[PDB]
Design an enzyme around this catalytic site. Sequence first.
Site, PDB file in Angstrom:
ATOM      1  N   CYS A  88       0.754  -2.869  -3.342  1.00  0.00           N
ATOM      2  CA  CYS A  88       1.395  -1.461  -3.195  1.00  0.00           C
ATOM      3  C   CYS A  88       1.010  -0.884  -4.552  1.00  0.00           C
ATOM      4  O   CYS A  88       0.591   0.065  -4.587  1.00  0.00           O
ATOM      5  CB  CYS A  88       2.951  -1.263  -2.773  1.00  0.00           C
ATOM      6  SG  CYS A  88       4.056  -1.833  -4.101  1.00  0.00           S
TER       7      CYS A  88
ATOM      8  N   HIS B  50       9.164  -0.914  -5.085  1.00  0.00           N
ATOM      9  CA  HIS B  50       7.829  -0.355  -4.315  1.00  0.00           C
ATOM     10  C   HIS B  50       6.936   0.650  -4.593  1.00  0.00           C
ATOM     11  O   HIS B  50       7.647   1.835  -4.494  1.00  0.00           O
ATOM     12  CB  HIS B  50       8.207  -0.527  -2.925  1.00  0.00           C
ATOM     13  CG  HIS B  50       6.913  -0.396  -1.800  1.00  0.00           C
ATOM     14  ND1 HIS B  50       7.108   0.763  -1.055  1.00  0.00           N
ATOM     15  CD2 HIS B  50       6.135  -1.233  -1.577  1.00  0.00           C
ATOM     16  CE1 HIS B  50       6.026   0.442  -0.239  1.00  0.00           C
ATOM     17  NE2 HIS B  50       5.274  -0.693  -0.558  1.00  0.00           N
TER      18      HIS B  50
ATOM     19  N   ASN C 152       2.905   5.821   3.109  1.00  0.00           N
ATOM     20  CA  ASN C 152       3.127   4.438   2.723  1.00  0.00           C
ATOM     21  C   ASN C 152       2.022   3.375   2.970  1.00  0.00           C
ATOM     22  O   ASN C 152       0.939   3.641   3.608  1.00  0.00           O
ATOM     23  CB  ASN C 152       4.386   3.893   3.766  1.00  0.00           C
ATOM     24  CG  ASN C 152       5.225   2.780   3.219  1.00  0.00           C
ATOM     25  OD1 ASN C 152       5.066   2.349   1.956  1.00  0.00           O
ATOM     26  ND2 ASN C 152       6.191   2.406   3.678  1.00  0.00           N
TER      27      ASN C 152
END
Length: 309
Positions: free
Chosen positions: A92, A252, A272
């Site tokens: 990520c 994240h 995302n």
Amino acid sequence: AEDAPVLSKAFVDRVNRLNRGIWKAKYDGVMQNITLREAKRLNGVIKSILPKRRFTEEEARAPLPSSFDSAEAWPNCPTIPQIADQSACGSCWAVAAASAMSDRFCTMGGVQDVHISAGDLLACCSDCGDGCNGGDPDRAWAYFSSTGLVSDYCQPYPFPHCSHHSKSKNGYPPCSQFNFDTPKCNYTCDDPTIPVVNYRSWTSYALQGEDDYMRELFFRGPFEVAFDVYEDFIAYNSGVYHHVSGQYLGGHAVRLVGWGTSNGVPYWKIANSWNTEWGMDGYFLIRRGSSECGIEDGGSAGIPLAPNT
Ligand SMILES: *[C@@H]1O[C@H](CO)[C@@H](O[C@@H]2O[C@H](CO)[C@@H](O[C@@H]3O[C@H](CO)[C@@H](O)[C@H](O)[C@@H]3O)[C@H](O)[C@H]2NC(C)=O)[C@H](O)[C@H]1NC(C)=O
Ligand SMILES: *[C@@H]1O[C@H](CO)[C@@H](O[C@@H]2O[C@H](CO)[C@@H](O)[C@H](O)[C@H]2NC(C)=O)[C@H](O)[C@H]1NC(C)=O
């Protein structure tokens, strides 16, 4: 840690009582069967060295709208709406970057459709972190100005679209059966007969607080942010997220692309790194102004450098 699935039928119900309906959670969504250990695996933010963004008088004073969406501000750029998937990794930190970096070669770099290679970043930047075991965005952007990266066309993202659903709505293979390690660092396109082209940014900096975010997003386009993922976030389906119950799972990294309000609730629209299946079609909406899960505590961005003269 444990292999205990994170989502409960009771857990979710609880959460849905405490959110007041503000945002819908789902227990039998795309994530029920997900492992505790599999979850923390997706949270690639581990461990400012970047100059804080200073806004010119002209910028600082501009009357930012109540609603703003990056795909609308720059309709001519296809990299903005595209949702990324980090597969079964802690990518990520890297994915979220290359995403904003692709998006920014448009808004600023003069190149319309260029997917920066998150894989290349993920495998060659060593001070950034351990690769697929955690990373630090600030350095991601530093390596973009420092070393520079390659297109996705040159060096594609090595892990396939992975689904956390026995039977995927787009027929991806299940995540459970994957366990990816930091790829090898390569210095020629995976197809050697493709010339290697290098894209660097000529400066990188850092953002803080609600207003820095909007103001920078407005002028320069999507950039990278991070926040704390709690167990409830996993069962996110729709509406405006804000933490109500759940264990900590890690920092994240995600890509910021907008803001608006929903029934008096200020929010950030965020793209995302997990499928188009997850949340609002890969997207989700957190809570602007609270600094929910620390989402406003730190951002990262840079200006790409137009190739040639
Ligand atoms: C740098 O280039 C090398 C070129 O091979 C890439 O390493 C290779 O990555 C591929 C795709 O992820 C791996 O494929 C896998 O092969 C195994 C069989 O060993 C199989 O079990 C899997 O189903 C899959 O097909 C391959 O293992 C791997 N090879 C090596 C030597 O590392 C690497 O991904 C490239 N790195 C970057 C950042 O582009
Ligand atoms: C989570 O697992 C459940 C059961 O462990 C899955 O539900 C089954 O799905 C199969 C096909 O994969 C069907 O034949 C059955 O009707 C279901 N059985 C039971 C006991 O539920 C489900 O696919 C998984 N959930 C998600 C969201 O992937």
